[PDB]
């Protein structure tokens, strides 16, 4: 919405300021979207009149004659306008004036006699939207005075944005019935006289829809002239509110819509032929539209009709050829109401939006017609010829919107506000809002007004009491609670702890878009279909996640294209996998993911230049997962995935469950996206590693231990699964600890075979270990190692 | 390259073996979080104190038999190592006023050495001062803290005791299983002579306080039985609390 | 993330505990439980991401508190951080922005005890440099409503957060009696708060994730 200042000040005149009115309009419920100017900043433009026009002597531009401002001297002032006929009083720039736009008028030569202050059009003065030429200002005006005071340029256009709770204040009367109460100034309603009909009868109407149109009116006006000029005194009111003219009658019936909130435009009478009957349309009924499309309805759309093919949708779209053309003689009006539960979705159903449909959906003042149609016909017959017939009443007395008895008690008001507002003030707040107040003992009974469609329950009285009492006229107090501790748990983790660990190891945390590209989303997870998205933003973002490796490998190639390398990021979010035995069709897990790439050590003075690999990722990950969690049993095996290398990748288990995927991506995956340099990724399923173990003490010994070196020779087939793990299970009182410090694949070992240096620190829980019992437990592990087709080496 | 350049998969990855806190440190921070989500904020101070901070402010008052049974570490006549962490809350109650609470962790010293008493052990003295709280609102908070520090395995019994700086007093004394009952903590409402020489009126105000031993709590919780092993600081004992 | 954790600590030392849930939701979690109820003009102005007829991405983080209020007996209070989605793209609105919806339900609290907590949170998130003004607004799931709208210095007032008491029809279709109980709620925008706090002015720069921008917040 947008409306002007002085039009609002016709109804209530608060002597506050030119801008502190816009600060008290936003303390009532209407969020103002800026206060914009109306014109440029000049210093006076005086209006005069022209006499006895003439033609150009030598050039091709006419108007070589004088003007008459009203000074006692007569100065020759010329122009070149396309409409400067004789007897057209226009404002003009003079010597005591500056024209905005940094083009100050001078006295140079332009194709003939010089000009000494030119004519100001619309765009030549400070305002917008030229039509043809100079200002066609109406006559019978005193001269010498200023256009800045005369045409009322000292106001502004405020753009208010009403919320759907308030259906009344979409117009001047709705806003100024609210400012008057919120500042307690009295509101002067302009008195609206009746019409005193003079002429014969009217085409009769009848509504056969008693539940979706409680009222409907109209009037004939016979003998109008649609070629009449639009009055400027109403054009300047319609100008500031962003409303452009059509001819005259659409202006008159946009003015009454803006002024009173009541929607009405026009009917032609001779193109009716059979009466007006208002009813629902049959299935498959088709009407026309202005844009060139020919749309239909289903069964529900109310259509204004006759005993023939129908001609108008209910308060949403009127009609092209059923409207007034340039030869229409008689006109009928549509002052109608519609039940807002009955007209809801028919605007957005057919791709329609119109300012009358915007009002009929929320609501409209149901006691308004006998003022609205009479103001409209007054402004119609006062600017055109003709006269009006009698009113046309069709109304249903029982299906009107009725008002409840909203009883309020002192307990609810006190328990909901917190403050003590006196009954002497509450019984005045509701009366000045405009309700009928019957106050009793410790209670209030107040029925609703007609114009507001948001007062049916007790909160809708408490809110409207406190809104006019003021929110910042209530003091403060902290709450009163009971200090229940609330349960905790020691044997679990938090997210912030693992995130603070990732920051300790050197990882940025990013947050990406949670819906990604289906083109480079299927290149990571083929086979599993995606959750597509109707009505997207573009084709680039039209698919939910299936993992977290889409936005991350978008962020990496964002940063690497901005001449900035070695990006280490991670991100925790939740993914969307399609299923069938799930809650809503997709199962969702919280996921912790990441990306490492670039250089390892960042160019240090002794640390060499070696790019990162899988052992670094797994070592920096085992601290994340298996330190703050179990490390009880965690097995790394080889499980394939069509997004990464088969060898340099793993599948973390933690007691027989697929919990993770780690390792460098496929080396032909990086041919797309162009991720310069070798990257690595590591995903983890969160709420299965979200429980730690609470530790327990045990008796500790004192005696030292010794370091025994074993170098088992194995072929290059088993990595560590049956080498470093079966050593611990043999003997539960002698072997603790197992290390490795040097591989052996040089020249001494046989080809295709390897020796892993397996150091041990053997110790006993109650005594020490001497040279006799060590030879039992080193040989017993080798006796348990010959089931893996190898044994120890001879060196 | 793809089916040839493979590596070993389950070798241990390179890192630095991270290390854990101390058990009394973990218990101090756990009870600090337990009381921080009720709004209690911590407070700290010095470890050396004159008599007017440690004894003559808690209404002892000096001829009482509490100046030899505390087993204090004296220096000359008006200096002593802090025997109970209460000067940190007296120096807070004196300055500001009067409806906020605090807790305080810290080190106390007592001249006792055996296989059951180190000369230093951490204590945790709470404090709360506001209008209209009583012994009901002491049981309903200490029962809640015990039920949250344990996991509802054990039973309590409020029995009477006597601390000079709080009267009427109590003792909470949770149920063990090896013996009959282990005494865990003690509490009580603040004596009005403690309030009156600070700047709070005991005719309208009230409050309580509580002091628990952190090493007995940690021993009973994580199963350790030798109290002297906490401060010899062996890594082979300390590595399991990580 | 830093602002979410800072306000999480700010409210955790009052006893509020967090609550989380899913990001996809049917209509009975997102619209028909907050008493919209479906013919209201709040099903196009929210700019939702639909799937078929009973699936939508979460438009406001309130199902995480409805699924908590439904299950367990009162009176408990919770907050909830999370991601919302709105079909709006410009140089002033990303399609995703984090919201933070509080909730508190217990006997005898009112609008006084709403101002006395939101004023306190604003005075603690800022360092008492700025002034507030409670003005009225309208959210469908809370009536009587408000808006808090702190004082800027470049313009006149920047609107930071909105609040209000819980409508009784929200309570009655959950299992709480609105004749004896009460409560309020509040929802603030985390990215406008972080922009106003640490001086950043370009809202789209938060989610392009440049390291040269992100390294100064360390």
From TrEMBL, chain A:
Pfam families: B3_4, B5, FDX-ACB, tRNA_bind, tRNA_synthFbeta. It comes from the Bacteria. One of its GO terms (cellular component) is phenylalanine-tRNA ligase complex. NCBIfam families: pheT_bact, YtpR. Belongs to the phenylalanyl-tRNA synthetase beta subunit family. Type 1 subfamily. The keyword ATP-binding applies. One of its GO terms (molecular function) is magnesium ion binding. Its EC number is 6.1.1.20. It catalyses: tRNA(Phe) + L-phenylalanine + ATP = L-phenylalanyl-tRNA(Phe) + AMP + diphosphate + H(+). Keywords: Aminoacyl-tRNA synthetase, ATP-binding, Cytoplasm, Ligase, Magnesium, Metal-binding, Nucleotide-binding, Protein biosynthesis, RNA-binding, tRNA-binding. Mg(2+) binds at residues 454, 460, 463-464. It is an enzyme of class 6 (ligase). Its main location: cytoplasm. CDD domains: PheRS_beta_core, tRNA_bind_bactPheRS. GO terms for biological process: phenylalanyl-tRNA aminoacylation. SUPFAM superfamilies: Anticodon-binding domain of PheRS, Class II aaRS and biotin synthetases, Nucleic acid-binding proteins, PheT/TilS domain, Putative DNA-binding domain. PROSITE patterns: B5, FDX_ACB, TRBD. HAMAP family: Phe_tRNA_synth_beta1. Its cofactor is Mg(2+). Transmembrane segments: none annotated. This is Phenylalanine--tRNA ligase beta subunit.
Automatic annotation (TrEMBL), chain C:
Tetramer of two alpha and two beta subunits. One of its GO terms (biological process) is phenylalanyl-tRNA aminoacylation. It is an enzyme of class 6 (ligase). GO terms for cellular component: cytoplasm. Its cofactor is Mg(2+). One of its GO terms (molecular function) is magnesium ion binding. Residues 7-196 form the Aminoacyl-transfer RNA synthetases class-II family profile domain. Binds 2 magnesium ions per tetramer. This is Phenylalanine--tRNA ligase alpha subunit. It catalyses: tRNA(Phe) + L-phenylalanine + ATP = L-phenylalanyl-tRNA(Phe) + AMP + diphosphate + H(+). The chain holds residues 110 to 327 of 327 of the full protein. Keywords: Aminoacyl-tRNA synthetase, ATP-binding, Cytoplasm, Ligase, Magnesium, Metal-binding, Nucleotide-binding, Protein biosynthesis. It is found in: Cytoplasm. Its EC number is 6.1.1.20. Belongs to the class-II aminoacyl-tRNA synthetase family. Phe-tRNA synthetase alpha subunit type 1 subfamily. Mg(2+) binds at residue 143. Its main location: cytoplasm.
């Amino acid at each position: 919405m947008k409306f002007s200042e002085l039009w609002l000040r016709e109804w209530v005149n608060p002597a506050i300021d030119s801008d502190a009115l816009a600060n008290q309009i936003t303390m009532a419920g209407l969020e103002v979207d800026g206060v914009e100017p109306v014109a440029g900043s000049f210093n006076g433009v005086v209006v005069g009149e022209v006499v006895e026009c003439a033609q150009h002597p030598n050039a091709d531009k006419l108007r070589v004659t004088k003007v008459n401002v009203g000074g006692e001297r007569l100065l020759d002032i010329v122009c070149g306008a396309p409409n400067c006929r004789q007897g057209l009083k226009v404002a003009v720039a003079t010597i005591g004036a500056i024209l905005p736009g940094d083009f100050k008028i001078k006295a140079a030569k332009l194709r003939g006699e010089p000009s000494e202050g030119m004519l100001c059009s619309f765009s030549e003065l400070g305002i917008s939207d030229d039509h043809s030429g100079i200002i066609e200002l109406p006559a019978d005006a005193p001269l010498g005075t200023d256009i800045r005071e005369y045409l009322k340029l000292d106001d502004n256009t405020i753009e208010i944005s009403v919320t759907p709770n308030r259906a009344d204040c979409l117009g001047i009367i709705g806003v100024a019935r609210d400012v008057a109460v919120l500042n307690k100034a009295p509101l002067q309603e302009p008195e609206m006289a009746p019409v005193t009909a003079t002429i014969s009868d009217t085409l009769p109407i009848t509504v056969e829809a008693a539940d979706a149109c409680p009222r409907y009116l109209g009037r004939v006006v016979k003998g109008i002239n649609v070629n009449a000029p639009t009055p400027l005194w109403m054009k300047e009111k319609l100008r500031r509110c962003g409303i452009r003219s059509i001819d005259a009658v659409v202006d008159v019936t946009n003015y009454v819509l803006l002024e009173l909130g009541q929607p009405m435009h026009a009917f032609d009478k001779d193109r009716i032929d059979g009466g007006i009957v208002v009813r629902m349309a049959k299935e498959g009924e088709t009407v026309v539209l202005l844009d060139g499309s020919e749309a239909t309805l289903n069964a529900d759309t109310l259509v204004i009709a006759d005993h023939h093919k129908a001609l108008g949708i209910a308060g949403i779209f009127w009609g092209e050829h059923s409207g007034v053309n340039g030869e229409t003689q008689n006109v009928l009006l549509e002052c109608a109401y519609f039940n807002p539960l009955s007209i809801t979705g028919r605007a957005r159903r057919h791709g329609l939006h119109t300012d009358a449909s915007h009002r009929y959906e929320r609501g409209v003042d149901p006691a308004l017609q006998y003022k609205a149609i009479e103001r409209a016909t007054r402004l119609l017959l006062d600017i055109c010829g003709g006269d009006a017939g009698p009113i046309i009443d069709v109304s249903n007395e029982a299906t009107l919107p009725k008002r409840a008895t909203i009883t309020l008690r002192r307990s609810k008001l006190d328990r909901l506000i917190g403050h003590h507002i006196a009954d002497e003030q509450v019984s005045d707040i509701l009366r000045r809002l405009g309700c009928e107040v019957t106050e009793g003992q410790d209670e209030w009974k107040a029925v609703a007004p007609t114009w507001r469609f948001d007062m049916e329950i007790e909160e809708d009285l408490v809110e409207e009491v406190a809104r006019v009492y003021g929110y910042n006229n209530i003091p403060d107090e902290p709450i009163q609670a009971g200090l229940i501790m609330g349960t905790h748990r020691e044997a679990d983790l938090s997210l912030k702890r693992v995130k603070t660990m990732l920051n300790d190891k050197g990882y940025q945390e990013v947050i990406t878009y949670s819906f990604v590209d289906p083109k480079v989303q299927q290149l990571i997870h083929p086979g599993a279909e995606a959750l597509l998205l109707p009505n997207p933003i573009s084709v680039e973002m039209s698919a939910m996640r299936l993992s977290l490796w889409s936005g991350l490998l978008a962020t990496v190639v964002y940063n690497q294209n901005r001449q900035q390398n070695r990006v280490r990021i991670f991100e925790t979010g939740l993914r969307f996998v399609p299923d069938t035995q799930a809650n809503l069709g997709i199962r969702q897990d919280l996921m912790l993911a990441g990306v490492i790439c670039g250089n390892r050590y960042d160019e240090h003075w002794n640390l060499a230049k070696e790019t990162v690999d899988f052992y670094d990722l797994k070592g920096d990950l085992e601290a994340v997962l298996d330190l703050t969690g179990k490390l009880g049993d965690i097995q790394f095996k080889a499980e394939m995935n069509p997004a990464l290398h088969p060898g340099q990748s793993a599948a973390i288990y933690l007691k027989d469950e697929r919990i993770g995927f780690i390792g460098v991506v496929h080396p032909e995956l990086e041919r797309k996206l162009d991720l310069n340099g070798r990257t690595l990724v590591f995903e983890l399923e969160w709420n299965k590693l979200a429980d730690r173990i609470v530790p327990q003490a045990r008796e500790i010994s004192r005696f030292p231990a010794n370091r025994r070196d074993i170098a088992v020779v194995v072929a290059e087939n088993v990595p560590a699964a049956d080498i470093l793990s079966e050593c611990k299970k043999v003997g539960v009182n002698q072997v603790v600890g197992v290390n490795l410090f040097d591989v052996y694949r040089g020249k001494g070992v046989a080809e295709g075979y390897k020796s892993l240096a397996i150091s041990l620190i053997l110790q006993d829980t109650n005594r020490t270990l001497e040279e006799e019992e060590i030879a039992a437990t080193v040989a017993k592990c080798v006796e348990a190692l010959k089931e893996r087709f190898q044994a120890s080496l001879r060196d | 390259r793809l089916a040839a350049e493979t590596i070993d998969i389950s070798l241990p990855g390179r890192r630095i073996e991270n290390g854990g806190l101390h058990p009394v440190t973990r218990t101090i921070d756990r009870i600090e979080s337990f009381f921080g989500e009720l709004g209690f904020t911590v407070a700290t101070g010095p470890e050396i104190e004159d008599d007017y901070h440690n004894f003559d402010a808690l209404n002892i008052p000096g001829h009482h038999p509490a100046r030899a049974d505390h087993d204090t570490f004296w220096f000359d006549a008006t200096r002593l190592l802090r025997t109970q962490t209460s000067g940190v809350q007296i120096r807070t109650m004196k300055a500001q006023q009067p409806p906020i609470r605090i807790i305080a962790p810290g080190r106390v010293y007592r001249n006792d050495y055996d296989q059951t008493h180190t000369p230093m052990f951490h204590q945790m003295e709470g404090l709360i001062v506001d209008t209209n709280i009583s012994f009901t609102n002491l049981k309903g908070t200490l029962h809640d803290f015990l039920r949250n520090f344990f996991e509802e395995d054990l039973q309590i019994r409020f029995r009477p005791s006597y601390f000079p700086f709080t009267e009427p007093s109590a003792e909470v004394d949770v149920m063990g299983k090896n013996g009959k009952w282990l005494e865990v903590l003690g509490c009580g409402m603040v004596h009005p002579n403690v309030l009156r020489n600070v700047g709070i009126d005991p005719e309208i105000y009230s409050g309580f306080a509580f002091g628990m031993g952190m090493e007995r709590l940690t021993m009973l919780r994580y199963g350790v039985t030798d109290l002297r092993s906490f401060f010899e600081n062996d890594l082979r004992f300390l590595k399991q609390f990580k």
